[model samples]
Target chain A: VLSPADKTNVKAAWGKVGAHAGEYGAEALERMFLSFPTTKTYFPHFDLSHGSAQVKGHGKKVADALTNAVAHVDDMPNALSALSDLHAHKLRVDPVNFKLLSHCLLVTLAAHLPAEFTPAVHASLDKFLASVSTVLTSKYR
Target chain B: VLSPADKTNVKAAWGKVGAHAGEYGAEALERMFLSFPTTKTYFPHFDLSHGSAQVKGHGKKVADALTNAVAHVDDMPNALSALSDLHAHKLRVDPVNFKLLSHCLLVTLAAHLPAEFTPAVHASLDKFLASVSTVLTSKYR
Candidate 1:
């Protein structure tokens, strides 16, 4: 759990991350499919078998979500609700994929912005990312 | 959107596609990406990608759906609902993409089974596929 100050740090860092999202998001999706192939079961056009466009396009969607989540952090229910149903119940994706995405997202963020992605921000973002998956399960429950 | 007899022909043809889905499904996906490159935008991985277990695995999920959809043709709602949300609302994918999928599916079917992939099935499936998009949009309406 992040303290009140930590939440502000997480939001500020994410704001910076979203600016470089065009590249960071794409790399994260690449790392995700390469590292966790099982997660490929969810997407039709974005699977590992095709080519680069799928990765670029799919990454944009995830980036879109992260970007939106940042702006709507104060009211995550609406933000996360957009994806919670499909990701949680419809696809029933492996829970770990969320963690994999988080890790890759961190790798991308940390590489780009060292000053913003400090240890505290890392911890705060981890909580934010982890909540995405945990909250998904909560919806099903 | 289909007449009674046309529906039967569609079900029969789809059954065949479903039966050979392991191979047929993969080929359809390949053709889809090739013929309609814009459709590839949905996936986060594309562009002369490579050999991985993902494509084959992903193909089976799609094939399995069409295969099962054949049995539930009478219950059209059940068949189309599987994708309606993801494509329509969640992704807000351009409705034309469904038509593109149907077009590639026809080409693949024609290449494989010249005789069965006749005018009637072509028309029937086109209407069916187009309705999938329209119905999805209307569902929210």
Candidate 2:
């Protein structure tokens, strides 16, 4: 279980990262999705042309959810209970698919950010993605 | 002054963009910054390496602020009021620097999103950025 101190540290770290939103946020995501020829298909399915409005709406929801999740990482069992249930019963997406998407996103990132793909950032992102994937997979399993 | 309808449209759009936070949102921003070798340096100066937690938190704040601004877009007095405060006191950065940063971001987008850089998306982003820039420049002047 994550201790209170651990939770605080997590929140603080999250805050630090969040502060950079002005530096790289929606514009970055839009570009990354477009970087790959194949991946660009996922967005068009959502009708991203008229979808910038929708994309912006969804972006905020994600940002809010992520912040809340980090704040509750110490009590993650309870924090993720609803999401787990949703995945198990309603969403029912394949666990492997999450990793596949992650890989796709990583490829997009690499292509767009070839220079800034430092070892430390890559490792950190990998670990974070793994943790998120576990939570997602555990929900359905 | 922004009308109620315009405000609603802006909020709705921003929310949609925010929802795909982890997958499309944060990662996109990170990659965009990385694409520009010089711009990437600005992130570290702001201590942007706190990882997912930080990105999530900051992303939420930005999304919320933008949503509010959009929701009030038609009401220049109200909409522009928020913009004035943010540009003048909150971010406190120079308008020219902000314009430069925005240009870098847009160029990076053009580079990575070869297929997805539709003229419409370009125009929309340009309008949004221009609006924000106008507010900042007004405050600086």
Per-candidate fnat, comma-separated: 0.00, 0.00
For all candidates listed, what's the TM-score of chain B alone? 0.80, 0.57
Residue B53 CA displacement from its true place in model 1, Å: 58
What TM-score does each of the candidates earn?
0.46, 0.35
Best by lDDT: 1
- Model 1 / residue B114 / CA error / Å: 62
The weakest ten consecutive residues by lDDT in model 1 chain A span A132-141
Give the CA lDDT, 0 to 100, for residue B2 in model 1.
42
Sliding window of 10 residues with minimal summed lDDT for model 2 chain A = A19-28
Please, what are the lDDT tens digits per residue for candidate 1 over residues B1-141?
A: 345675787787887665676666667777777777777778767442443356666767767766655566555445667566556657787757766776776677889887688787777776665544454432321
Residue pairs with backbone overlap in model 1: A46-B43, A51-B46, A51-B47, A52-B46, A52-B47, A54-B43, A54-B44, A54-B45, A55-B44, A55-B45
- What tier of docking accuracy does candidate 2 attain? incorrect
A37-136: candidate 1 lDDT, tens digit per residue: 7766666655454358777777787888887776766555566775877776677777777888889889888888988888878877887776555545
Over A1-141, each residue of candidate 2 has an lDDT whose tens digit, in order, gives 222443444455456556443223344445445544454544564545423766556545544555666766644435666666665447665666556545654554455456655554454444444445555545322
